[PDB]
Amino acid sequence: RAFDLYFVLDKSGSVANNWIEIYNFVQQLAERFVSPEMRLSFIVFSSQATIILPLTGDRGKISKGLEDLKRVSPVGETYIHEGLKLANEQIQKAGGLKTSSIIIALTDGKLDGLVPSYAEKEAKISRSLGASVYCVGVLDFEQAQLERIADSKEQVFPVKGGFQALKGIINSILAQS
Ligand SMILES: [Mg+2]
């Protein structure tokens, strides 16, 4: 069995100044961790969510997906629940409980209105489908909001300034989740 990693990436206006940090992290994880036995998908969200790269193990498609992420221009609202929903839909189509799926959400966790309730519910759906949910926090991120989305506080990592966050997340994923 081999991992399917779903990157769910915040392109809202709030994170716009750190889009390059988000992008670099995605590339680092894809290159350092996502082996030929693994697959990945790239999803972005603001007021709408989009699959930039559908789930694939093809390294050529992954490179083209990274090029596409380079061209993203963050602006707009933060409907993270719709990004999670597109990961869950692909997970369901791949076989739900029969897959080893990992969701990695890159966000500041700055959510309003009913969006926290929607996001927490969609992440509980992800766990029910057998996925482990991670959050990688951007800027002055909301620790507690990320902890209610990720499986646990041990699966929340800062994108910047943390001690060995990349190694830590790899180690976490490999230890099952
Ligand atoms: Mg935002």
CATH number at residue 43: 3.40.50.410
Cα separation of 43 and 79, whole Å? Answer: 12
- C-alpha 167 to ligand 1 mean position (Å): 27
Task: Please count the other Cβ atoms lying within 10 Å of the Cβ belonging to residue 155.
Answer: 23
- C-alpha 135 to ligand 1 mean position (Å): 14
Binding residues: 12, 14, 78
Please indicate the experimental technique that yielded this structure: X-ray
Strands (E), the chain: 3-10, 39-45, 49-56, 100-107, 132-137, 156-158
- C-alpha 113 to ligand 1 mean position (Å): 13
Cα separation of 47 and 76, whole Å? Answer: 6
Domain range for 55 is 1-177
Biggest alpha carbon–alpha carbon distance for the chain: 41
Instruction: Tell me which H or E stretch contains 171.
Output: helix 165-174
- C-alpha 79 to ligand 1 mean position (Å): 8
* Residues contacting residue 70 through CB under 8 Å, at least 6 positions apart: 23
Q: How far are the Cα atoms of 77, 113, 115, 123, 149 from residue 118, in angstroms, in the given order?
A: 14, 10, 5, 9, 10
Q: How deeply is 124 buried, as exposed, middle or buried, from its count of CB atoms within 10 A (0-12, 13-18, 19+)?
A: middle
- C-alpha 19 to ligand 1 mean position (Å): 12
Binding residues for a divalent metal cation: 12, 14, 78
Q: How deeply is 170 buried, as exposed, middle or buried, from its count of CB atoms within 10 A (0-12, 13-18, 19+)?
A: middle
Structurally, the chain folds into a number of domains equal to 1
Pairing of strands 49-56, 39-45: antiparallel
Nominal resolution in Å?
1.8
List phi, psi (to 5°) of 41.
Answer: -140, 145
- C-alpha 116 to ligand 1 mean position (Å): 12
